[PDB]
Amino acid sequence: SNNSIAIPTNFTISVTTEILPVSMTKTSVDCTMYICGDSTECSNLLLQYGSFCTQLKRALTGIAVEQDKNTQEVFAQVKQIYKTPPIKYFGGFNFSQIL
Amino acid sequence: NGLTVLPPLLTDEMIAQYTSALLAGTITSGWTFGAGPALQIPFPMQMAYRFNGIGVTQNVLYENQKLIANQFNSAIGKIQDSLFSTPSALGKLQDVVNH
Amino acid sequence: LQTYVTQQLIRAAEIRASANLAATKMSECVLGQSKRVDFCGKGYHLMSFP
Amino acid sequence: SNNSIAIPTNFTISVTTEILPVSMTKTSVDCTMYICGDSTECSNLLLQYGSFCTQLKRALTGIAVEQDKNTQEVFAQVKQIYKTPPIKYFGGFNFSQILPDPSKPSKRSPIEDLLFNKVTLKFNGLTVLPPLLTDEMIAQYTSALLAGTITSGWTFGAGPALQIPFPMQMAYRFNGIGVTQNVLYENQKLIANQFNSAIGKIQDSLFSTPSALGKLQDVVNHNAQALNTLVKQLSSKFGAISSVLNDILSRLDPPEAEVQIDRLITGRLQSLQTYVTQQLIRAAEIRASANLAATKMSECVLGQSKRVDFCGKGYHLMSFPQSAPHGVVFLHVTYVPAQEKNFTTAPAICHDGKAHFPREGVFVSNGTHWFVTQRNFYEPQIITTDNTFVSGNCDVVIGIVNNTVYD
Amino acid sequence: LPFQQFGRDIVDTTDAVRDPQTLEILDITPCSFGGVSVITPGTNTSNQVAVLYQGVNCTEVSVAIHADQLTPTWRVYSTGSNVFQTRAGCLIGAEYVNNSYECDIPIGAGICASYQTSQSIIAYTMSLGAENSVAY
Ligand SMILES: *[C@@H]1O[C@H](CO)[C@@H](O[C@@H]2O[C@H](CO)[C@@H](O)[C@H](O)[C@H]2NC(C)=O)[C@H](O)[C@H]1NC(C)=O
Ligand SMILES: *[C@@H]1O[C@H](CO)[C@@H](O[C@@H]2O[C@H](CO)[C@@H](O)[C@H](O)[C@H]2NC(C)=O)[C@H](O)[C@H]1NC(C)=O
Ligand SMILES: *[C@@H]1O[C@H](CO)[C@@H](O[C@@H]2O[C@H](CO)[C@@H](O)[C@H](O)[C@H]2NC(C)=O)[C@H](O)[C@H]1NC(C)=O
Ligand SMILES: *[C@@H]1O[C@H](CO)[C@@H](O[C@@H]2O[C@H](CO)[C@@H](O)[C@H](O)[C@H]2NC(C)=O)[C@H](O)[C@H]1NC(C)=O
Ligand SMILES: *[C@@H]1O[C@H](CO)[C@@H](O)[C@H](O)[C@H]1NC(C)=O
Ligand SMILES: *[C@@H]1O[C@H](CO)[C@@H](O)[C@H](O)[C@H]1NC(C)=O
Ligand SMILES: *[C@@H]1O[C@H](CO)[C@@H](O)[C@H](O)[C@H]1NC(C)=O
Ligand SMILES: *[C@@H]1O[C@H](CO)[C@@H](O)[C@H](O)[C@H]1NC(C)=O
Ligand SMILES: *[C@@H]1O[C@H](CO)[C@@H](O)[C@H](O)[C@H]1NC(C)=O
Ligand SMILES: *[C@@H]1O[C@H](CO)[C@@H](O)[C@H](O)[C@H]1NC(C)=O
Ligand SMILES: *[C@@H]1O[C@H](CO)[C@@H](O)[C@H](O)[C@H]1NC(C)=O
Ligand SMILES: *[C@@H]1O[C@H](CO)[C@@H](O)[C@H](O)[C@H]1NC(C)=O
Structure with a gap:
């Protein structure tokens, strides 16, 4: 209606959660062991294939370094380690479950 | 067969310490510690500002x-039950491990 | 091996996007109070804890 | 403690930097030249493989066009080229290091010159295409963005540009x-x-540290390395008897050279596909970075931001852009408190059985007298009905302290 | 040195050879190559075109044309003020003006093309916008 309004008279305090992934597992692979277990003939044959194995190593190393960069960025925001006071009275608010 | 898994640079205790510092800073100082020196203030006054x-x-x-x-206390209390009873809460982290 | 590595690269890009979002949320909901609608929860934001 | 506060009595102006990649190199590849140099037999054999070569061309063309779209989005924010006044007095602030320098032939700032000198650094069917915008045009865009924000503030990003003296703009900020x-x-x-000293230190901090522009350096290095790998992959056998098509055809019987030619064809085609996929992934990453750069240009240069730690560490004041090879550099200016002090505080004041709260500020005490102050800079005042409101009797509040309020 | 025969670059492609008859070292270079691009307005408008030879000096394409040593055989009308040199390559079929308009068809390092007025195809240096100065 063009002359009617609604105004709240009471409130509510609510808590919700949110989950976010940050990092994953770091792995490395060895071409010779995986493709040609211990045979010398297989490694000699694989030599005539170029740099298909340097590239995989470089890619996996880049992924591994980025995995640490992610965690460093999210969590190392602060510069000093703050300590909480021995007494835990904060005006009636209770923080035991999160401290 | 030639496949390895590398440990992360930061152990779980260090991540817990970072989280604890972030919690202690925001209780005894508000939002001032994220922009300079940390300046203390009683908690009800910080809530009044908010x-x-x-x-x-x-x-x-x-x-x-x-x-x-x-x-606030009751809302924090219900979180344990809401997280624990529901099994599919941490589906994202579970999928990260599973893949 | 090539298939495995390509799949890993794509998943890593997705994880990096998620981590950037997490860092922004840490900066703006924990170190301050946010005015963006529905960024730090549904309602009028007060504070957050990690 | 539950009755103690700290309030700063002095501040600091600081300047930090931020580097972001924007675009990468544009390349094109010719299948026939790379796979089958000039032999007709190899091309005839490659014909029976389908459209594996139209797809690579389309993918590379899409990457090349997106590379120009990125630069267009970041830098062509404004619509008019603004000029700065001939006189350069702006209330005592000094902008010489960031404004264009006429003596230099390329019309670049000293800091832009430092960056340009710091970064720095036809195969077989492989080409490199020049970007659509030359470096001078990007410098002109940057100069217009700088001139607009000095003589107008943030008004030129939302309509007509309205002038204002610089100290008044700083007062607004x-x-x-x-x-x-x-x-x-x-x-x-x-x-x-x-501000002048903070701008001065930037030259030394950028110049002395070598690893500052690591992101732009890596952008150049990866593109160089991929091409070197691609060309040096041309001398592999892939199980054939040789790596030269002429030597295969010279000393072999035509129905017997087909096997070797097929092996070479498959190997080289696999190499091309690997190169193209890697390029696509890197392009997606660069596009994400360029979108972030465009947002930062909109929200830190054309206005003042309230997001925490978006335009530098501290309380944001303003930012300035600088053009770098394949990227952009931001100079964020922030406000930082300093020199705090203990104080005693109370939430309300009782006077004649009436509670009192401050309209804007916090009640503070120096041990004997009670004042009211703004909560970012120590400036005590005398409590009065002109800076308080009543709203309550005297007893619901906890920790209320009673004193005198004048009129 | 008096015992080598070849010259090898970083990526192991020969780029210097000594003559066996007379001991003289000759530097070698691949013959020119590159892409070809066609600039056209809509076929609804007209049927004229311009051709861009990417990354090549204009004298080389002129010489190869005059000695019929080019692979794609167009031999577009090349007499007069239609051959222009850009940082992207040799542009044939459009005349260069010294005005400045908004970009219509991107070509190269700050050069665009358009169909203007009789009617013909022109090339110009693109304009970033109208110059302005605020009275500070
Ligand atoms: C605002 O809402 C709160 C919460 O429902 C009300 O507090 C309740 O009041 C009733 C009646 O006095 C009690 O039976 C409940 O136990 C109270 N809740 C709690 C958590 O203690 C409050 O009365 C409401 N305010 C107004 C003005 O109606
Ligand atoms: C904060 O909440 C916790 C959770 O209940 C309280 O812990 C309880 O403390 C009482 C003693 O006061 C015990 O009888 C309960 O068994 C405790 N519960 C649990 C789950 O451990 C804690 O007391 C609260 N904080 C304060 C200051 O009282
Ligand atoms: C706020 O800080 C500034 C910067 O330190 C102070 O200015 C300095 O004052 C001292 C003593 O007068 C001088 O020796 C310095 O040379 C000043 N610095 C500069 C850059 O000129 C200022 O005095 C401080 N304000 C208060 C109230 O203490
Ligand atoms: C802004 O800062 C520059 C940088 O120092 C000043 O340039 C100096 O000017 C003086 C003359 O006043 C010369 O003696 C110095 O050699 C200059 N320094 C450099 C590095 O060139 C400039 O003067 C300042 N702006 C104003 C208006 O004074
Ligand atoms: C709008 O206001 C007019 C009077 O100004 C009133 O007659 C009319 O009923 C109103 N509209 C509605 C939907 O109530
Ligand atoms: C909190 O305030 C009470 C008085 O209201 C005081 O006795 C107590 O010491 C205070 N707590 C701390 C930690 O100082
Ligand atoms: C504020 O009070 C605490 C507690 O006594 C003290 O350690 C601190 O040094 C005080 N602040 C200043 C600036 O002296
Ligand atoms: C507090 O400020 C008043 C200002 O009127 C001054 O007279 C008094 O000496 C101050 N007390 C202390 C301890 O500095
Ligand atoms: C003023 O404050 C004191 C201490 O809190 C209290 O004892 C006194 O009753 C207050 N004044 C009145 C009129 O209540
Ligand atoms: C090969 O014969 C030519 C013919 O005169 C002569 O000039 C040249 O010196 C000879 N080469 C050597 C290595 O003697
Ligand atoms: C083209 O060749 C001529 C002579 O061969 C040379 O003078 C000119 O500089 C060359 N073009 C360019 C763009 O360098
Ligand atoms: C265009 O005009 C300029 C004058 O600014 C002149 O230098 C140039 O030669 C002209 N272009 C021609 C004649 O093609």
Whole structure:
């Protein structure tokens, strides 16, 4: 209606959660062991294939370094380690479950 | 067969320490520690500032302090049950491991 | 091996996007109070804890 | 403690930097030249493989066009080229290091010259395409963006540009972080000196440190390395008897050279596909970075931001762009408190059985007398009905302290 | 040195050879190559075109054309003020003006093309916008 309004008279305090992934597992692979277990003939044959194995190593190393960069960025925001006071009275608010 | 898994640079205890510092900074200082030196302030005054920051005057908190503290305490309490009973809560982290 | 590595690269890009979002949320909901609608929860934001 | 507060009595002006990649190199490849140099037999054999070569061309063309779209989005924000006045007096602030220098032939700032000198650094069917915008045009865009924000503030990003003297714009920007106007007008000279010295230190901090532009350096290095790998992959056998098509055809029987030619064809085609997929992934990453750069240009240069730690560490004041090879550099100017002090505080004041709360500020005590102050800069005042409101009787509040309030 | 025969670069492609008859070292270079691009307005408008030879000096394409040593055989009308040199390559079929308009068809390092007025195809240096100065 063009002359009617609604105004709240009471409130509510609510808590919700949110989950976010940050990092994953770091792995490395060895071409010779995986493709040609211990045979010398297989490694000699694989030599005539170029740099298909340097590239995989470089890619996996880049992924591994980025995995640490992610965690460093999210969590190392602060510069000093703050300590909480021995007494835990904060005006009636209770923080035991999160401290 | 030639496949390895590398440990992360930061152990779980260090991540817990970072989280603890982030919690201790925001209880005894508010939002001031994220922009310079950390300046202390009592918790009810910080909550008064935060109410002032959403269009509600200060006196509401000072007149409803005890009720608001009880509401916050109960809301924190329900989180344990809501997280524990529901199994599919951490689906994202579970999928990260599974893949 | 090539298939495995390509799949890993794509998943890593997705994880990096998620981590950037997490860092922004840490900066703006924990170190301050946010005015963006529905960024730090449904309602009028007060504070957050990690 | 539950009755103690700390309030700063002095501040600091600081400048930090931020580097972001924007675009990468544009390349094109010719299948026939790379796979089958000039032999007709190899091309005839490659014909029976389908459209594996139209797809690579389309993918590379899409990457090349997106590379220009990125630069267009970041830098062509404005619509008109603004010029700066001939005189360069702006209330004591010094902008010489960031404004274009006429003596230099390329019309670049000293800091832009430092970056340009710091980064720095036809195969077989492989080409490199020049970007659509030359470096001078990007410098002109940057100069227009700088001239607009000095003589107009943030008004030129939302309509017609309206002029305003620089100290008044700085007063508005202090007003925008919870500090009253008179602080700037009473500390103008000191603040200008602080800004000048902070700009001065940037040359040394950038020049001495070698690993500053690691992101742009890596952008160049990866593109160089991929091409070197691609060309040096041309001398592998892939199980054949040789790596030269002529030597295969010279000393072999035509129905017997087909096996070797097929092996070479498959190997080289696999190499091309690997190269193209890697390029696509890198392009997606660069596009994400360029979108972030465009947002930062919109929100830190054309306005003042309230997001925490978006335009630098501290309370944001303003930012300036600089053009770098394949990227952009931001100079974020922030406000930082300093020199705090203990105080005793109370939430309300009782007077004649009436509670009192401050309209804007916090009650504070120096041990004997009670004042009211703004909560970013120590400036005590005398409690009065002109800066308080009543709203309550005297007893619901906890920790209320009673004193005198005048009129 | 008096015992080598070849010259090898970083990526192991020969780029210097000594003559066996007379001991003299000759530097070698691949013959020119590159892409070809066609600039056209809509076929609804007209049927004229311009051709861009990417990354090549204009004298080389002129010489190869005059000695019929080019692979794609167009031999577009090349007499007069239609051969222009850009940082992207040799542009044939459009005349260069010294005005500045908004970019229509991107070509190269700050050069665009358009169909203007009789009617013909022109090339110009693109304009970033109208110059302005605020009275500070
Ligand atoms: C605002 O809502 C709160 C929460 O429902 C009300 O507090 C309740 O009041 C009733 C009646 O006095 C009690 O039975 C409940 O136990 C109270 N809740 C709690 C958590 O203690 C409050 O009365 C409401 N305010 C107004 C003005 O109606
Ligand atoms: C904060 O909440 C916790 C959770 O209940 C309280 O812990 C309880 O403390 C009482 C003693 O006061 C014990 O009888 C309960 O068994 C405790 N519960 C649990 C789950 O451990 C804690 O007391 C609260 N904080 C304060 C200051 O009272
Ligand atoms: C706020 O800080 C500034 C910067 O330190 C102070 O200015 C300095 O004052 C001392 C003593 O007068 C001088 O020796 C310095 O040379 C000043 N610095 C500069 C850059 O000129 C200022 O005095 C401080 N304000 C207060 C109230 O203490
Ligand atoms: C802004 O800062 C520059 C940088 O120092 C000043 O340039 C100096 O000017 C003086 C003359 O006043 C010369 O003696 C110095 O050699 C200059 N330094 C450099 C590095 O060139 C400039 O003067 C300042 N702006 C104003 C208006 O004074
Ligand atoms: C709008 O206001 C007019 C009077 O100004 C009133 O007659 C009319 O009923 C109103 N509209 C509605 C939907 O109530
Ligand atoms: C909290 O305030 C009470 C008085 O209201 C005081 O006795 C107590 O010491 C205070 N707590 C701390 C930690 O100082
Ligand atoms: C504020 O009070 C604490 C507690 O006594 C003290 O350690 C601190 O040094 C005080 N602040 C200043 C600036 O002295
Ligand atoms: C507090 O400020 C008043 C100002 O009127 C002054 O007279 C008094 O000496 C101050 N007390 C202390 C301890 O500095
Ligand atoms: C003023 O404050 C004191 C201490 O809190 C208290 O004892 C006194 O009753 C107050 N004044 C009145 C009129 O209540
Ligand atoms: C090969 O014969 C030519 C013919 O005169 C002569 O000039 C040249 O010196 C000879 N080469 C050597 C290595 O003697
Ligand atoms: C083209 O060749 C001529 C002579 O061969 C040379 O003078 C000119 O500089 C060359 N073009 C360019 C763009 O360098
Ligand atoms: C265009 O005009 C300029 C004058 O600014 C002149 O230098 C140039 O030669 C002209 N272009 C021609 C004649 O093609």
